[PDB]
Amino acid sequence: ALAAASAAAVGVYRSPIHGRGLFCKRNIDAGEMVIEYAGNVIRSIQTDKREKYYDSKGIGCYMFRIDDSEVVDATMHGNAARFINHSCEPNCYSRVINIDGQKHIVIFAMRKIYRGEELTYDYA
């Protein structure tokens, strides 16, 4: 697993792309699991309403689209992976994986990443 490794590998700081982003604290090998997109799998029919709720309470909403019927809501139970910004020439990608029966969104490195480099991936 990697729940341990991740805190030592990545960190959250300001990003020239937008807002805060996830940056690399130590070199990450191409192929390496960088981090999980922690959250709860909700049915994508509920993203509209949940987002209404969060916007009304001034909570920042973080959601990751698994597919056309499930998204991972990271607003309340996420982790640092919700700050990963988008790029069309990224250095990461999402993959849905299955561990003992549970879905998981895990971020992998496309190339080797170097200290201080923002981590990105393609949204759509």
Binding site: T47, C61, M63, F64, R65, V71, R82, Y123, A124
Partner: peptide, 4 residues
């Protein structure tokens, strides 16, 4: 991917 985010905010949807």
């Amino acid at each position: 991917v985010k905010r949807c």
